[PDB]
Design a binder for this molecule. Structure first.
Ligand SMILES: Cc1cc2nc3c(=O)[nH]c(=O)nc-3n(C[C@H](O)[C@H](O)[C@H](O)COP(=O)(O)OP(=O)(O)OC[C@H]3O[C@@H](n4cnc5c(N)ncnc54)[C@H](O)[C@@H]3O)c2cc1C
Ligand SMILES: Cc1cc2nc3c(=O)[nH]c(=O)nc-3n(C[C@H](O)[C@H](O)[C@H](O)COP(=O)(O)OP(=O)(O)OC[C@H]3O[C@@H](n4cnc5c(N)ncnc54)[C@H](O)[C@@H]3O)c2cc1C
Ligand SMILES: Cc1cc2nc3c(=O)[nH]c(=O)nc-3n(C[C@H](O)[C@H](O)[C@H](O)COP(=O)(O)OP(=O)(O)OC[C@H]3O[C@@H](n4cnc5c(N)ncnc54)[C@H](O)[C@@H]3O)c2cc1C
Ligand SMILES: Cc1cc2nc3c(=O)[nH]c(=O)nc-3n(C[C@H](O)[C@H](O)[C@H](O)COP(=O)(O)OP(=O)(O)OC[C@H]3O[C@@H](n4cnc5c(N)ncnc54)[C@H](O)[C@@H]3O)c2cc1C
Lengths: 385, 385, 385, 385
């Protein structure tokens, strides 16, 4: 029957993640955000505690955890800080295509190294000319004997300057009229290959401690063995990685919203205006109640999506619902929390403004809200045929 | 661990409820709403199928089902029609205080009769002067020997003119300064007792097939044996019945929203404007996607509340969250569905306008949205102490 | 410079309209809505006071008032009742094409009769197959000598069963690929012409005292003199009547919202819950403040649109903005007012539920909200070319 | 009658302000925001063009413009940059109490200096312990012979480190039970007086080019001639300055929203996704239409408030409505504009993220949204007595 109770192992994972977050990430998150420095010690500590690369199977040396455990761990880490959590989950996002569409040789070679030492990997799909239209990318992969020549440029690549290897999606079919199901090929490109020109670090409004760079490929030689299932099969692999990665980003948004709610409540429990405690004004109490409702609903949505994908079904409908709702409620919670603190909320010495700046990408990256609504509408309509 | 899978018995209950609803209630719901007639045959059929009085324990002849099964059955029935579902759930709402705070004699006497024949019961708490302020009622219960003399009037009583017996909450303590925890007493009052004057049927905007009447009590003699746990214990019983009844009304709102979404989608799949199908306009598709998201979130919320109360914990926080969110999304879905059908939506020969009229009470009765937000804020604040 | 002060004549018109509304329409509006009877005495009284057919020029015997005065009068009448105001403004809506695109003979013949006696006219454009897509109508007008043969059916015609003559828009060009600018012709069709089959009165959710019927045309002979500017010029006339009619319906929505706000405030000033006046709870006060803000903004928007059209400019942008915003805020205000009254709000003996039922058409008829947003987006984009 | 047409002088002022903004402020606004430097050259240029200190009467050497002209100028400047506009309007905010409650000597002495050279003034009311509760300030002013000794600290003072003199509000009455109407006194305190300790520059989320500092007063001697109307009259002066200053900040929010809308539209007119221009997707077009509607409504609201105060009436109701609505729509427009640009919107090399960061204070300073709703509710309720 229905159940909303964690297992003992999941409880242990949640306790470890919460302890690590609230005892390591929080004391230094503000400094890392202010300086924009890459949190190498925090990433190493997360790797040591087994909070990173959770999806790697036990055969390759990983823990082989499901998406539910990854979601709860990512929620705790995002409660810690969203930039650090994004940097950590970039590894899982890059690894997912290799895990789901890789043979034994590729899996061992490109995941045992991740298990042995705290390395990083990226997910190079987005281009300057097409970010939402995945079929609109123009990076070309030309086959030359036993190698592929890749030319093009990618933009907004998380861990672009820190990754050990990249998952690259390029258009193998030169025919513009070729269908998207047979035109794109996935590759495993090492970061040290000649011809890769990593661009400057991009400065963003939020999550300033994470590394986001543009990458330019110029006559990069990729061996034939570093190809996925085959030519023209890249698009399906890229689209199938989303079904397992979207609940994680939804969980991160939920954790950010939970942090904002905690800060707002803790501030409202001590501030006094008009001779009464700030929580004794009905407007503030109703605001807090609505924030709590949104947080609980978003958490339930992402947990449902994670359980759905973990059970072997397709969770595109639930994953899109959870991602969209979490992205919206994260921004709403962040702005409400900034409103609650008043003038101190607008100041940079209080955590709420950082959360407000960080919450914006959850409506942009990993599929914008409009794309999520498109997917939800398509699935809903298909349910009526 | 977490699970979102029904049991086989729950699947059978859901199948029976859906079949009964969509094959009996729907063909006659419009006529019953238009004429305002009490749906006696539908209530009898629901009683025959075991879809009514589900909370009665097996000792008294009932099925002894949990609130989860009641919630799913009520969702299916509300998909059928909200007026019929409200009339059916009035029995459970009236019976809940007797089930949770009744001795063997009272339980047998006042529940075996419900099991044997399709009788009805009501829940008389609300007064013309105080509906939300439960502590503000002024019906007085004066003890005279081995009987209680009750004087006062109640307003907005579901099944007021059809109930076999009433659950009455009256203020036993005449001291105005007495605390609410020791001032109110619950009673089991039969409908045939002299001194009970049932008023005229009230005409409402929606759910016009349900019976809602005001009741006037004038020197009604109630035997001492028809009293609950004791004098001054009525308030806690009344407040504890809510923890088990609110998920049911939330499920009813969810079912109404699901009906509205189904009607809107089915209409949008055939209507053509500007040379394209009505679902091919991005505005309509986004509207449908948001409606589906709201429906799924509300369903998950009420299911979580039902599971929480079924596990022995206190679910006031989750029940209030589910009730508030379902009440809001029901009205939003109803008005969006009326918008989708255009001019035909405003007409009375299409089901959407009836749903829009019916959806309003879910933000009013069984605790208004403001009271739900008050409860949610109180629980959230208590979680931080 | 800028000014927000009425003229003395406009103040006199507003005073007369408010007095007539609040002393005649309100005492009988509930009865007319409940019985669905056509308010003939109220229409006659409005005609006697000069509150109807305001756009007729002084040459034809009318008052020759601008759209600003019509807007304020319609706002007062809609504060009285929306059904009566809709029945009254149907005359102006039907007459506007004749006023703006009629020669002296047609204007005299078909407006002097309106001036002399309280007659009615309708606006037959919408068809069962296309209501929003005006270019999608399929009523055909075939020229036969000095007459036009018209075949087709219209749906949702205000004053359909009471009009003395109709303004009919039909597709003269049989070529499906013909542009909309040269395919439709406008006609002045008398209601007594043989071949016109008025259908049954349609029953709607709100404004039940207004007459809305479907009309079937079967070989109706229209003389050549009853044609507007010429063949293929009907579409531009129909689209230009909107620029002068939309502010009036926006004003009606504003008046309905003002009525809802007045009822909610007057109820909240006497109701007491939890020992305090209902207006002393911050939630209720904030709700009332937001309602007042919305009412004021909508009033300013429609007044701006009326002034813009009265100054000789094109006000499509402002008219669409005002119509959309007023339509939204009317429904929001109505549902908030129903929420404020609590259980009494859901009852039919209080005016708020009638306002909630009536407010829905302002998001449907005279251009749905989606069409208004389309027009606003088109104008906004054109401003950037 | 009603009019929405500017005068020729107002058109000239608007043209000058728009030219200055879009040719001087925009090219350097990003650099000033990034470095946090005080825009001295821009302030000097605005002073030279007569765009600063507009409220000073012609007797003291000012232009003697009404609040309408100040509102339009501030809207243009805020379209330029919100930080520069805030720095400029700080002078008007500080000067307003002196203008409305100053004798000839004080007006000449403390406004002729502003006219002669580009000096700055501040408005010191807010304290660390009470920002919204103006009656809750605790800065004490003790009279000692012909001087006042002032002790206390102020927080969030615009132009705190750059002002030539301050308007200080202090509690003269030491009795805690004294009414607010007779307990506070206003002072004109020069910035060079010994005992004034200007704190460090505060770092905020947005408007980082404006100077906001905390000020500590320690035994500051203020001569008796630098007092306003008298002891206990400070509170009314402070509350009356709001009626003339709130429309200006509302206009600034409107200008920021207009800038966001312009950027979003200009980007959407060139970006192509899924083979179509980004403005050809109905979701984006509807978003733009709603943004334009909000901008127009907010502009009309603030213009109405400015005209109302310029006509000699009290505009507290309209000023609060305009301030609240403009503050809300500014944030909504900013976040929608960031959403439209997608990934580029989150980057710091595009203007939208700066607007999103800047828009937050319009819901915080000069009266938070909750205080505005309180004022609107109070005025609305008083209208019904
Ligand atoms: C901090 C950050 C980190 C990132 N990390 C990664 C990473 O690791 N890997 C990676 O591959 N990418 C990454 N990205 C890129 C991200 O995935 C894309 O930028 C995002 O999916 C949208 O890209 P875009 O701005 O080009 O969208 P655009 O298409 O340029 O946006 C246009 C706007 O219109 C909307 N829109 C577009 N098409 C439609 C339509 N058909 N209907 C309706 N609305 C529509 C969009 O929602 C958007 O608001 C990152 C981006 C950021 C900001
Ligand atoms: C169709 C129908 C069936 C019903 N059936 C039953 C039944 O079977 N049994 C039964 O006992 N009752 C029944 N009721 C009554 C219902 O439970 C109450 O009417 C409802 O709880 C609110 O009653 P009220 O209108 O008196 O609320 P009021 O208190 O009169 O409403 C005042 C308004 O202010 C708000 N408000 C009140 N107090 C506060 C506060 N402190 N803070 C903020 N906002 C506040 C409320 O939300 C409401 O909008 C029924 C009502 C209806 C319409
Ligand atoms: C009470 C009443 C009185 C009326 N009186 C009159 C009258 O006097 N004269 C008259 O001519 N008509 C009248 N009408 C009809 C009215 O003008 C039309 O019904 C209305 O414009 C919409 O008609 P529809 O339902 O066919 O719209 P539909 O097009 O059938 O509605 C489809 C739905 O999709 C939306 N939609 C449609 N096209 C698009 C698009 N391209 N993009 C996005 N969304 C879209 C619509 O907003 C709507 O929600 C009346 C209607 C009513 C209810
Ligand atoms: C950039 C900036 C510049 C500023 N410049 C100036 C300046 O030049 N001069 C000046 O005097 N001040 C200035 N201020 C201060 C500003 O005026 C105040 O900070 C603001 O009015 C609110 O202050 P607060 O944070 O103390 O509000 P708080 O009262 O501490 O905020 C508490 C929260 O609860 C809400 N709240 C409070 N009371 C109630 C109630 N009764 N009911 C409901 N909700 C309530 C508030 O809206 C807020 O969200 C500036 C502030 C900033 C950020």
């Amino acid at each position: 029957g229905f159940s909303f109770e964690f297992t003992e192992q999941q409880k242990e994972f949640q306790a470890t993640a919460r302890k690590f977050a609230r005892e390591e990430i929080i004391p230094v998150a503000a400094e890392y955000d202010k300086t924009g420095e890459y949190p190498v010690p925090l990433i190493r500590r997360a790797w040591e505690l087994g909070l990173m690369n959770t999806h790697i199977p036990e055969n390759c040396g990983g823990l082989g955890l499901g998406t539910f455990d990854a979601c709860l761990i990512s929620e705790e880490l995002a409660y810690g800080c969203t930039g650090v959590q994004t940097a950590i989950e970039g590894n899982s996002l890059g690894q997912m295509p290799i895990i789901i569409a890789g043979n034994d040789q590729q899996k061992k070679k490109y995941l045992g190294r991740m298990t042995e030492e705290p390395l990083m990997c990226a997910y190079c799909v987005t281009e300057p000319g097409a970010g939402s239209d995945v079929a609109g990318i123009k990076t070309k992969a030309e086959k030359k004997g036993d190698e592929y020549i890749i030319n093009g440029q990618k933009m907004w690549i998380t861990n672009g300057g820190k990754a050990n290897w990249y998952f690259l999606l390029a258009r193998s079919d030169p025919d513009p009229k070729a269908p998207a199901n047979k035109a794109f090929t996935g590759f495993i490109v090492e970061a040290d290959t000649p011809g890769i020109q990593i661009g400057r670090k991009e400065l963003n409004m939020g999550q300033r401690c994470s590394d986001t760079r543009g990458i330019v490929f110029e006559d990069v030689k990729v061996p034939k063995e570093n190809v996925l299932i085959g030519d023209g099969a890249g698009f399906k692999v890229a689209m199938g990685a989303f079904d397992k990665t979207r609940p994680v980003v939804a969980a991160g948004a939920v954790g950010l919203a939970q942090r904002a709610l905690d800060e707002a409540t803790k501030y409202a429990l001590e501030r006094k205006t008009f001779g009464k405690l700030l929580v004794e004004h009905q407007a503030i109490s109703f605001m807090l109640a609505e924030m709590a409702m949104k947080v609980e609903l978003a958490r339930m949505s992402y947990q449902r999506a994670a359980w759905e994908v973990d059970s072997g079904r397709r969770n595109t409908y639930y994953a899109s619902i959870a991602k969209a709702f979490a992205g919206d409620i994260a921004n709403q919670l962040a702005t409400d929390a900034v409103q609650i603190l008043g003038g101190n909320g607008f100041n940079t010495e209080y955590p709420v403004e950082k959360l407000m700046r960080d919450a914006k990408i959850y409506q942009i990256y990993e599929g914008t809200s409009q794309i999520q609504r498109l997917i939800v509408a398509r699935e809903h309509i298909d349910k009526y045929k």
